[PDB]
């Protein structure tokens, strides 16, 4: 359902999103803090594509990788602690 799909993607994609090369290069140009950031992007993707994908795991995993580099570059020194301004910028 909608409660088990998001929980599976969190415990399966958090170990590869916070240690990516794009996120590590953005904090030096502009571990508990990076966990909530990657978990917020996964929850925002499922809630915004629950009707386009349905309940498939492959349909939601491709949309995360397609929007991960575009979501990291839109994070500055102020969007790290304020999740409200980060959703409006992207």
């Amino acid at each position: 359902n909608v409660d088990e799909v998001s929980t599976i993607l969190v415990m399966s994609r958090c170990g590869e999103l916070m240690e990516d090369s794009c996120l590590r290069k953005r904090i030096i140009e502009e571990d508990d803090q990076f966990q909530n950031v990657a978990a917020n992007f996964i929850h925002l993707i499922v809630q915004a594509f629950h009707s386009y994908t349905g309940n498939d795991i492959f349909a939601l995993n491709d949309l995360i990788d397609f929007k991960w580099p575009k979501y990291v570059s839109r994070i500055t020194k102020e969007n790290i602690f304020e999740p409200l301004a980060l959703y409006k910028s992207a």
Partner: protein
Amino acid sequence: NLNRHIRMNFETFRSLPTLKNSIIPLVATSKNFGSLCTAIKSCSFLDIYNKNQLSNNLTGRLQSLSDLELAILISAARVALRAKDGSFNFNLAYAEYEKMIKAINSRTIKLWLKKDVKNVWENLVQLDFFTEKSAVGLRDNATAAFYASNYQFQGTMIPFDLRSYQMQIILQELRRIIPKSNMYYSWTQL
């Protein structure tokens, strides 16, 4: 509780190997002697096995759908019901779905573009809901399976928006497996 499950299987299945498929996991799942006498008296594990066997059919697959997957199947059912032979395609299903969103908001549901329903349309076909018109499907023996693979059907050359499909469930059966709390219940009467 043991005599109730036997009498229920006697008038529905009446088969010994069929009823034995639930007694085997009931005993193996018991940790000690106290858990074996409890599950054999209340038969709590037998009700869970019956729900799992009817969870991937036409009824259990409807509860695992979102709001858009239910609106497409409902709008496509009204087209085949009002027709003579029940033939419909992606163009006929999109016309009924577009007229339903503008009618509800007039009395905010995000109206998806035509480029986004293609992914939802292909997901319902794999879930056994939209069958091709005049399609054999799975052959009986291996002789007819080889001759059907070498012949190119007419449904593969035509685009996806002009493929004649058929509904696996009529609108009369969708009104019974949908509660009154859903907002798509008013568009299932016609």
